[PDB]
Design a protein around this ligand. Structure first.
Ligand code: A1LZM
Ligand code: A1LZM
Ligand code: A1LZM
Ligand code: A1LZM
Ligand code: A1LZM
Ligand code: A1LZM
Ligand code: A1LZM
Ligand code: A1LZP
Ligand code: PGV
Ligand code: PGV
Ligand code: FE
Lengths: 275, 63, 23, 29, 29, 318, 62, 28, 63, 62, 63, 62, 63, 63, 62, 63, 62
């Protein structure tokens, strides 16, 4: 139940908050106080999701949604049957994500590694927070935040995108879709490169960093290298999450017309070609 | 400025000046194209064709 | 003990189940 | 000034600031 | 009125960030 | 704070490495290796040399021919005004044939130029894939990069050729335009129900969001464990070090399970290349098997049902 | 920082730079004089818009 | 009236807080 | 407070104060611009122009 | 933790800081006095809205 | 509380207090601006301008 | 864990801290007294909404 | 303040001041362009051209 | 300022000034273009053509 | 923090910098004088909008 | 300027000039195609076909 | 910086460069002269728009 080398690192300390009381492992998982709070928020939020499934009679992961209150509700606490369950689960999700990231900070301290992983997770959490708080603050109510349904939040994404007519044309959407595609492209390239170096044809020896460098130099003229590929990957995925922040915070709050009309508003009128 | 190349790379300066002058020749030619008076590609008339006297530049003319 | 089963219609009774997701 | 004209002027100003700052930002360590 | 009503607080947020930047940098370094 | 492994503050330069010996490398490797200090901040500074192979050169030439066909069509669309091309750069496109041709190759200006460019672009992409394969093989590498490109190209051929052929109409194919191919996205999703209700769309987005997740997490993991030389991952795979151990233990203590230095790349490789593969499956089923993803997910209890509106719109056409 | 070029190298670079700059400058001045004689670059107080001097039937791009 | 008093107070504060005058109160 | 620099970095404090004050001067000038009374750029009249008596600030005036 | 500056360095830093803060403070106080005499910042009970004091033909942005 | 600095970093405390007070001054000035009674920039009248009696704060005034 | 500051350094910091905190505190109390005399912060039972005391022609943002 | 360069980088200070002053010169010129009274490029008239008397700045004029 | 190059790199200063002035010349030329009075590319009439008297700049003219 | 430039190197950089700065400054002053004599930059109290001085048929871009 | 190749890479200069001239020949031929007068692909008439006199270029022709 | 090319190498590079530049320049001058004789590049003061010289039935792309 423990890795061949795991016990060698399973030491006390590294906790941000929890001391030695929560500083232990249950099976593979390190717990920590932030693990305790993450489990609390996760299980309570899932129990509120089940409560909405019960009250809405929607026992389908796909059809069940915790939607935020109505727009007329504003920032007020809603009835649990009118968006209050969504508010509870929003608090639970923020708490669980923050607790998970802080538990990862604890694990990083215990392993002596940098806090890059909880930082990247915190970038994703920052998207969630700015989407579920920043968009309500910009637009004046919890009802502008996306709901909690496996399929229904896709419907919210659909409707919020089509509120600006053609959401593809959103500048933040264009940049962020390019960034997601570049992230999957670079993950494919990087996994393929590492596996190609370490899994050549049968009978061939494992190649080196020189091999992979000259592979991408021969291939596309540039090789970003071992450190560069991971730096670029963290950058690409993070930047796509920041692009998601900008997209969710600008569609509506900072452009209520169509994003096609947004593009028409400035690009065709750029004076170097508007004549 | 003959000592400038003791401190400023001449290759960088000349290359950047040629690049910027390519961009600027394009931009200036496009500025002329944008101007109806100056667009030789469209070939519009000059207002001096229909003027009676010289408009001048600093002539301080009056209506 | 549903209130709708005992109270007169002048008493507002709200069912436990909501119609938000007619699935 | 027209909003497109002033916006393009601001764009050229921001580009000028970036171009002036680029040798600064390159040597900023 | 106009767009300066929010520009006050955008510049306020920028001022807070700018005042904290040497603090965050000194902490970082 | 600690060094975050985000930028290389001190770059070192050796002699410009032409590359490991490959058959034809001495001739086909072209370009004096140039060192970008800006690129050296993140990764390797060296730019070049590039392999000037037959597949690479002809694929690049075909890409150029395709791009120039698109540009000439855009020019002829805006009366050969480069000014109007740049003004309408995002809107302009080489449009696909209309439905009245079906699978017929139409005249150039009725979508024939699109099919011409599709042939050129598809052949160029196949030559580029061949270059990927051959560049990997010449260095004694696996062809994993070639097969990731093959997954992406399979999705591309589904978008452009295979699925338009199966539907029997070239108008189902992807227009060659910035805004036009996004309009193709909208038209495909709304014509065929809703791709939000397409489970292969769901899975492809799961794998794209998870490519971002894994590649953020993996880049962060490698930058965090770069204190222990974990970025040299080939060594950590053949000679497992404390950096790979710490990465595995971080993820095991977080998620309960971890990967290895090689298996994380297996995970990321498959999570990435699954995006175009299940994407191709879902797109192909859209218009061949599935007419409405909304109706299909209604039958499968996939589509949410919301509160009935007060005063719904009634279809005046019954 | 110092480029390392000697005085003689800087002097020959400067001779070439003077030649390039001043040849371009003079050829461009002749070009601008030619284009100015063709159509003066700057309007007088009356302007040089066609809408103000041409008849109504002479179309203007404004 | 009140505005004049405010202006006078601000001017007096500026004069007193001027470095030449405020520094005379320096003690180390 | 000359001893503050024994504990608080003066360069950090001064740089932060200067950045904060630049952006805060921007904020306050924007506060003036947002005000019809105080926008010198648009130059609206003051209500004191149309008032027959001094409005005051703390003066207990009544309608 | 101490910054490391000696007493003399702290004293000269403080001299410069007093000069900067108090010069800026006095110039800003004069500027605020000038802006207050130009238009007092605080409206008074009647207010200073143009709609409440100016005739109906005086346009007010409020 | 002169002994607090044996246990709490004064540089951290003072820097945090200055940052938080800059933020809180911004927030409080925003609160005043959002109040019609207190927005000096828009300069609305005070209701006391229109009252015949002092409203008070704790005064048990009745309608 | 302590900070390493001596009793003398802590006393110097406390002198500066008392001076800064109490100077701000007193300037803020003067400022709040001035703004309170200008417009009392807390409404009476009658409130201080313009719509409740001002005539109808007086515009209120509420 | 000649001792400031003992504690603050002069190159950093001067470079940042030139950057910020280029930015602020642009911002102020755009503020003038925004103002109808001050937009020299549009060339709008001054209200003083139509006033019968000097408006003043601090002058206590009445309507 | 001849000692400025003891502390400030002249290559940096000169390159930054040349780039800033290139894009600032672009900006200023475009500002003239955006102005109807100053757009030589469109060549609109000057108001002085239709003015009976010299408008002045500082001259305190009245309607 | 020090560029390492000697006394004479700094002086010759300054000679070139003065030459470039002041030559650009003088040529720009002459250019602005020419453009000012062509069309003065700053409008008088009357302004110089064509709408306010030209007849109605003279179209203005405002 | 035979000494330019002591400081400026001739291979870089020649390759860059050939690349830029390929792009510039494309751009200029495009400019001709854009022009109605110069578009040989469309083959529009010249206005000189309908002129009864030489328009000139620098000729001081009047309507 | 220095390319390392000898004076003879620079001279042969330069003779080839002069040949290429001036041959291209002369062929381009002949080409521009031919295209100018075909249709003069620059309109006369009357212009060369078809809408101003051709009859109404002659279509112009303006
Ligand atoms: C073999 C060898 C060789 C050479 C060499 C050399 C040397 C040594 C040198 C040079 C030069 C040079 N060039 Mg060259 N070349 C060659 C060629 C050529 C060609 C062809 C293609 O053929 C061409 C076209 C050329 C051009 C040139 C130019 C760029 C230059 C400069 C001039 C001037 O500046 O005047 C000029 C001057 C002056 C001052 C003028 C000014 C303005 C400025 C900006 C303006 C700005 C403006 C703006 C921005 C605004 C606009 C507006 C509108 C509305 C928009 N190349 C060969 C290859 N070379 C110089 C320089 O760079 O400097 C630094 C020098 O030194
Ligand atoms: C009609 C309409 C429409 C739309 C809509 C819209 C809107 C409104 C928006 C959007 C978006 C976008 N998108 Mg889209 N769309 C379209 C389409 C598309 C396409 C194609 C192909 O076509 C493409 C590719 C695209 C993509 C995209 C990207 C980029 C983005 C997304 C991503 C995100 O965000 O997330 C992000 C997200 C995030 C970060 C998240 C995080 C978690 C957290 C912490 C974690 C944790 C959790 C958990 C639960 C735990 C678990 C446990 C275990 C399991 C045990 N698109 C159409 C058109 N759009 C956004 C933005 O903007 O960005 C920029 C927004 O806002
Ligand atoms: C329509 C048409 C047109 C044109 C045309 C073209 C093309 C196409 C091109 C060009 C050019 C160029 N120009 Mg020119 N022009 C024009 C005008 C002008 C002006 C004015 C002001 O107006 C100027 C200043 C110029 C100038 C120049 C240069 C910078 C270059 C040459 C080079 C040289 O250096 O020699 C040459 C040089 C030169 C000329 C320079 C000189 C100064 C002198 C001393 C002084 C000045 C004055 C001023 C600024 C003030 C104004 C006044 C009025 C009354 C307001 N541009 C028209 C508008 N183009 C080029 C370029 O860019 O390259 C890159 C090209 O490509
Ligand atoms: C309309 C227009 C306007 C203005 C204008 C401008 C601009 C543009 C600017 C400015 C400023 C500034 N200011 Mg002013 N103002 C204004 C008002 C005011 C006030 C009130 C109260 O309201 C205050 C308190 C101020 C203050 C100041 C400072 C803090 C800064 C600096 C200066 C100095 O340092 O010295 C100076 C300083 C000083 C003046 C300070 C003083 C204290 C004292 C003793 C105590 C306190 C008291 C109180 C609060 C009472 C209340 C009243 C009632 C309610 C009745 N501001 C108006 C509204 N600006 C600047 C800045 O921010 O920078 C950063 C800028 O830029
Ligand atoms: C309209 C207008 C206005 C104002 C104004 C402004 C501005 C602009 C500013 C300010 C401030 C500030 N304030 Mg004030 N106010 C206001 C009110 C008030 C209050 C109430 C009560 O309400 C308080 C308590 C305050 C206070 C304060 C502080 C906390 C800060 C600082 C300063 C000082 O320190 O002084 C100093 C201090 C002080 C004053 C404090 C004291 C306590 C005492 C003993 C006790 C308490 C009592 C209570 C709470 C109960 C009553 C109520 C009832 C209902 C009857 N504020 C109004 C509403 N501001 C600032 C800041 O934040 O910074 C950071 C600024 O900027
Ligand atoms: C329409 C048209 C126009 C123009 C135009 C153009 C172009 C195109 C260009 C230019 C320029 C340039 N300019 Mg000018 N202008 C204009 C005006 C002006 C002004 C005014 C105020 O108004 C100024 C101050 C200027 C200035 C200048 C410089 C900064 C640069 C450089 C050059 C030089 O160096 O000179 C040099 C310098 C000079 C000339 C000048 C300086 C001081 C002086 C002594 C004195 C001062 C005074 C003041 C500021 C105030 C007055 C008052 C009134 C009553 C309010 N700009 C007009 C509006 N442009 C250039 C550039 O930017 O490059 C970068 C170009 O390209
Ligand atoms: C169609 C119609 C057309 C055309 C046509 C074409 C094509 C297609 C092509 C070409 C070209 C080319 N051109 Mg030309 N043109 C045209 C005009 C012109 C001009 C004017 C002025 O206008 C010029 C200056 C030119 C020039 C040239 C060169 C630079 C290049 C190269 C070649 C050579 O080298 O020769 C050689 C060289 C040469 C020819 C040049 C020489 C100096 C001279 C004497 C001096 C200057 C003067 C001036 C500017 C005066 C103005 C006028 C007035 C306004 C009166 N182009 C028309 C518009 N294209 C090419 C290219 O780009 O390549 C890359 C091509 O492809
Ligand atoms: C730019 C960087 C990114 C990035 C980076 C990164 N993400 C990381 C890490 C790093 C570095 C981790 O280190 C961490 C980890 O341990 O696994 C690898 C983690 C993780 N992310 C997960 C999901 C993920 N992430 C996504 C996006 C990115 N992730 C972006 C692309 C996306 C989407 C949609 O794109 C998903 C679904 C989990 C698997 C795991 C957190 C577990 C948790 O929160 O515990 C907490 C444990 C649980 C069970 C949470 C339950 C909490 C509430 C009460 C349950 C209800 C859920 C909601 C209300 C959410 C909305 C529902 C939607 C239907 C509307
Ligand atoms: C500097 C930061 C300080 C900390 C944050 C402080 C912010 C709020 C604390 C408020 C304290 C309790 C006040 C309860 C008042 C409830 C009655 C009410 O209705 O007050 C509401 C207060 O909101 C509210 O409680 C908002 C709170 C409702 C809970 C919603 C839970 C979902 C999000 C969870 C996030 C967890 C993190 C006001 O909203 P409305 O005026 O209707 O909006 C109308 C819109 O057009 C906006 O104008
Ligand atoms: C990152 C982002 C930071 C940069 C943000 C730039 C924002 C520019 C300002 C917005 C454009 C604008 O629209 O600014 C307008 C004009 O600005 C004016 O004059 C004043 C001139 C505009 C000043 C612009 C301030 C620039 C601030 C730079 C911030 C970074 C500085 C960093 C320094 C280290 C303000 O609105 P108005 O139409 O006058 O309203 C009129 C009503 O209020 C009347 O009652
Ligand atoms: Fe990796």
């Amino acid at each position: 139940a423990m890795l061949d080398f795991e016990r060698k690192y399973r030491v006390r300390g590294g906790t941000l908050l929890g001391g030695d009381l929560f500083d232990f492992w249950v099976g593979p998982f390190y717990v920590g106080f932030f693990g305790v709070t993450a489990i609390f928020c996760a299980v309570f939020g899932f129990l509120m999701i089940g409560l909405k499934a019960a009250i809405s009679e929607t026992w389908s992961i796909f059809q069940l949604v915790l939607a935020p209150p109505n727009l007329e509700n504003g920032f007020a606490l809603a009835p649990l049957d009118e968006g209050g369950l969504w508010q509870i689960v929003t608090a639970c999700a923020i708490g669980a994500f923050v607790s998970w990231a802080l538990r990862e900070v604890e694990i990083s301290r215990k392993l002596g590694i940098g806090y890059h992983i909880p930082f990247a997770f915190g970038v994703a959490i920052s998207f969630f927070v700015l989407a579920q708080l920043g968009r309500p603050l910009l637009l004046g109510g919890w009802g502008h935040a996306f709901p909690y349904g496996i399929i229904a939040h896709l419907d919210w994404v659909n409707n919020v995108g089509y509120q600006n007519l053609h959401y593809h044309y959103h500048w933040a959407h264009m940049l962020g879709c390019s960034l997601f595609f570049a992230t999957s492209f670079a993950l494919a390239l990087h996994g393929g490169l590492i596996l190609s170096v370490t899994n050549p044809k049968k009978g061939e020896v494992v190649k080196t960093a020189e091999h992979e460098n000259t592979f991408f130099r021969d291939f596309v003229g540039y090789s970003i290298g071992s450190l560069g590929i991971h730096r670029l990957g963290l950058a690409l995925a993070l930047s796509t999450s920041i692009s998601c922040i900008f997209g969710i915070l600008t569609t509506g709050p900072f452009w209520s017309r169509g994003w096609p009309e947004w593009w028409y508003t400035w690009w065709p009128q750029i004076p170097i070609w508007n004549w | 400025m003959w000592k400038l190349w003791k401190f400023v790379d001449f290759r960088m300066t000349a290359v950047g000046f040629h690049l910027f002058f390519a961009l600027l020749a394009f931009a200036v030619h496009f500025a002329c194209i944008s101007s109806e008076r100056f667009n030789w590609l469209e070939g519009a008339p000059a207002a001096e064709y229909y003027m009676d006297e010289d408009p001048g530049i600093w002539k301080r003319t009056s209506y | 003990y549903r209130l709708e089963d005992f109270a007169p219609e002048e008493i507002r009774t709200d069912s436990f189940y909501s119609d938000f997701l007619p699935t | 000034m027209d909003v497109v004209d002033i916006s393009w002027l601001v764009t050229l100003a921001v580009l000028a600031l970036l171009a002036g700052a680029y040798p600064v930002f390159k040597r900023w360590r | 009125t106009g767009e300066a009503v929010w520009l006050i607080w955008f510049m306020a947020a920028l001022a807070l960030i700018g005042g904290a930047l040497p603090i965050v940098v000194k902490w970082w370094r | 704070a600690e060094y975050q492994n985000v930028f290389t503050r001190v770059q070192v330069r050796g002699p410009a490495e032409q590359g490991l010996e490959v058959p034809g490398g001495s001739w086909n490797r072209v370009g004096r290796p140039r060192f970008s200090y800006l690129l050296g901040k993140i990764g390797d500074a060296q730019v070049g040399p590039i392999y000037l192979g037959a597949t690479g050169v002809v694929a690049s030439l075909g890409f150029l021919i395709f791009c120039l066909m698109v540009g000439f069509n855009w020019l002829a669309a805006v009366d050969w005004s480069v000014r109007e091309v740049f003004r309408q750069f995002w809107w302009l496109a080489v449009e696909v044939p209309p439905p009245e041709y079906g699978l017929r190759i139409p005249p150039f200006n009725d979508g024939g130029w699109f099919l011409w460019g599709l042939a050129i672009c598809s052949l160029s992409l196949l030559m580029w894939w061949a270059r990927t394969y051959i560049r990997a093989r010449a260095l004694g590498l696996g062809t994993h990069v070639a097969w990731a490109f093959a997954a992406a190209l399979w999705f591309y051929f589904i978008i452009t050729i295979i699925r338009p052929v199966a539907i029997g109409s070239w108008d189902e194919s992807l227009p060659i335009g910035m805004f036009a191919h996004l309009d193709w996205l909208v038209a495909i999703s709304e014509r065929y129900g809703n791709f939000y209700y397409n489970p292969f769309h769901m899975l492809s987005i799961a794998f794209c969001f998870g490519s971002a997740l894994l590649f953020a997490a993996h880049g962060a993991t490698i930058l965090a464990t770069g204190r222990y030389n974990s970025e040299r991952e080939i060594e950590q795979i053949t000679d497992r070090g404390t950096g790979s151990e710490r990465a595995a233990l971080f993820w095991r203590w977080t998620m309960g399970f971890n990967a290895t230095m090689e298996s994380i790349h297996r995970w990321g490789y498959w999570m990435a290349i699954l995006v175009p593969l299940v994407a191709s499956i879902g797109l192909f089923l859209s218009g061949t098997v599935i007419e409405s993803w909304y109706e299909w997910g209604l039958k499968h209890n996939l589509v949410p049902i919301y509160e009935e509106l007060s005063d719904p719109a009634r279809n005046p056409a019954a | 920082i110092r480029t390392g070029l000697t005085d003689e190298e800087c002097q020959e670079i400067h001779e070439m730079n003077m030649l390039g700059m001043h040849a371009y400058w003079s050829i461009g001045l002749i070009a601008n004089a030619l284009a100015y004689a063709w159509r003066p670059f700057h309007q007088g107080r009356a302007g040089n818009r066609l809408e103000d001097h041409a008849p109504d039937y002479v179309r203007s791009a404004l | 009236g009140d505005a004049g008093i405010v202006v006078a107070v601000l001017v007096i504060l500026a004069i007193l807080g001027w470095p030449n005058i405020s520094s005379t109160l320096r003690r180390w």
